Every structure is written in structure tokens, then in C-alpha cells.
A paper describes a structure:
We also investigated if larger compounds such as the N-(2-acetamido)-2-aminoethanesulfonic acid (ACES) analogue, that has an acetamido group after the ethylamine group of taurine, and 2-(N-morpholino)ethanesulfonate (MES), that contains a morpholino group, could bind to TauA; we measured an apparent affinity of 7.4 µM and 2.8 µM, respectively. In light of the binding data, we co-crystallized TauA with 2-AEP, ACES and MES and collected X-ray data at 1.62 Å, 1.5 Å and 1.55 Å resolution, respectively. Inspection of electron density maps revealed electron density for 2-AEP, ACES and MES. The ACES with its longer acetamido group displays similar interactions as the taurine complex but its amine group is making additional hydrogen bonds to Asp84, whereas Asp84 in the taurine complex is bound to a water molecule, and its acetamido group is stabilized by hydrogen bonds between the side chain of Asn55 and the main chain amine of Ser10. In the taurine complex, the site occupied by the acetamido group is hydrated. The crystal structures of TauA with 2-AEP and ACES appear to be in ‘disagreement’ with the ITC data since the structures show that these molecules have formed more hydrogen bonds relative to taurine, they display much weaker affinities. Our structures show that upon ligand binding some waters have to be displaced to accommodate the larger alkanesulfonates such as ACES and MES. We also propose that desolvation of the binding site, loss of water molecules, contributes to the lower affinity for ACES and MES over taurine, although they display more hydrogen bonds than taurine.
In E. coli, the ssuABC and tauABC gene products encode for an ABC transporter for the uptake of alkanesulfonates and taurine, respectively; TauA is the SBP that recognizes and binds taurine, TauBC is the ABC transporter that mediates the transport of taurine in an ATP-dependent manner. The SsuA and TauA proteins belong to the class II SBPs that are characterized by two globular domains, linked by a flexible linker, that form a cleft where the substrate binds. TauA is composed of two α/β-domains (domain I (23–104 and 202–319) and domain II (105–201)) connected by two-loop hinge regions (103–106 and 200–202) with the substrate-binding site located at the interface of the two domains; both domains are composed of five β-strands flanked by 11 and 4 α-helices, respectively. Although, SBPs are usually described as highly specific for their substrate, we show that TauA is capable of binding different taurine analogues and alkanesulfonates, including phosphonate analogues, with different affinities.
Author numbering: 22 to 319
The structure:
Amino acid sequence: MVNVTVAYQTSAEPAKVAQADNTFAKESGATVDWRKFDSGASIVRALASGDVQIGNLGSSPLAVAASQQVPIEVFLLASKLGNSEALVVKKTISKPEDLIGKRIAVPFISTTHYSLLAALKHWGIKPGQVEIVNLQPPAIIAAWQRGDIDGAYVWAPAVNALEKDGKVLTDSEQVGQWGAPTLDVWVVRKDFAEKHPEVVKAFAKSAIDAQQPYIANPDVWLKQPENISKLARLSGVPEGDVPGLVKGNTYLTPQQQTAELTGPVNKAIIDTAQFLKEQGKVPAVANDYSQYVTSRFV
Ligand SMILES: NC(=O)CNCCS(=O)(=O)O
């Protein structure tokens, strides 16, 4: 018997169809505990303690984990993040200069904490000029509803909840264009990969297979009602928000997976870690993270 705990997150993306269909468990034969995490920092800790064996991490929590020598490897990309992650603010905040003195929430060292710091740097605003507070996305929604924060840089379901009444000031497609792109990845603990390599391959296969029908023709994929309802259920968003969210990233073919895992992801971690060091969020970094990426499961 193989038991595996998988830490998943709430982005609405096509591989959620494979999760809702239980395809990984069916094809691998493992008993799979899918555990929902509110952001990536807590996933890094659960991977480090051995409580989780496969986890979905943003590129910023990934660089923190790799700088702390957590024994995990990226074995699959989930998505290249675009405007599915966004800074949503009170409507009276009209320009980036209006963020000065405001209370802006982000989950600690998430991709949106990272993107917020990169956006402030791009705008010429020191992070000390903004009251950046650390809250998990459910608490962000609650604080926003009570008017205790002025905005947040968030992903689904918080991003669409806040946008119902707020205004988008920037998003991670823009921040990517400015030179700080962010990614979502899947990582695996080494000891699990050593013992159950065919289960890890089955995970990658299930996720990659599920994204290819979307890549081939987004509009045809999005008009299959069961695709929309499965993502709405697992992300916790209204069905009407799913197409805009799914189109807010790009996804990879199998050829693109192998290409990105053979160099570009390493370079992504190096650059992400460097910026986090400059921003004071990690004490030490490395000039190479090839121990933390592999193409051998795709
Ligand atoms: N993976 C997701 O669904 C949200 N994007 C990354 C969040 S974090 O950086 O891991 O906190």
C-alpha cells in the first residue's frame, strides 16, 4: 500500500479536472489524501516535516524552501502566472502613489508578496512606505469585508471576491513584463521519489494530460460544462468567474515541460531567490539550484 498526501491550492486551472476526477489515485493505485492549503509557506513547512510528499508551490515559496535546503524537487510546472493574480484595492486608490500609507495584505512570501514587492520597486516606492500585512486569503476576504485593509495582492478565490467591489491596480502579467515573472510548480520530497517513482510519474502524467485539451483549444475546453463546474467547485469560485481565471495563465505542452525543467526553472529559482535576498526575506542564496529541479518524471 502507498499512502501519499498532496498539498493543493485554490487557483482555477485545467488540471483541477484531473483532481476532481481522482485520476492520479486511479492511475497510480495509491490512496491519496488531497489537503487544501491556503498559501505556500505552510506547504513548505509540511513538506519539510514529511507531513506532505507532493505539493503545489508558487515560485517564491519554492525559492525560500530551496534556500533552506528542504529536500524537494520541482518535477512539473503548473502554470506561468498572469492576471489570475492581481493587486485589488479600494476604489479611491487610483494611482500607485496612493498606496503610500495604506494597509495592503499578502500571504507571507507567496508569489503575490513577491509580486507586490517587485511592483513597488518598479513604481519607485519603498516597501516601508506601505503597511504590508501578512494574512492568509480567507482572513484577507474577511478583513476586506470589514474595511480593515485597503487592498491585497491575491489569487482565487480572494482575487475575484475583492474585485467585486474593488479595482485592479496591477497584476502578475504586468509584473512579469516588468521582469519579475512568477510560476506555480509541483514539488516532491526526495525520499518519496526514491521509494515510489512510478507514483510520481503518474502524478505528472495526470496533470499534464489534463492541461493539453485546454492548450489545444481554450474556447472548446471552456464550453464543456463539466470542465467549468469542477474548477468552480475546487477553487470555490462562481462558475461565471472560471473562464477569466483560467485564461489568466498560460500552460505547458509536454515538450515545453521538458524544456523548462532543463534550465529555465533553475534560472527562475536563482533570480527569485536573489530578489528575495535583496528585499530582506531570505538570509542566504545560491548561484545554482539544479538540485531542486528535475525532468526525469515527465
Ligand atoms: N498555487 C496557487 O494556487 C497560488 N499561487 C501561488 C501561491 S504561493 O506562492 O504558493 O503562496
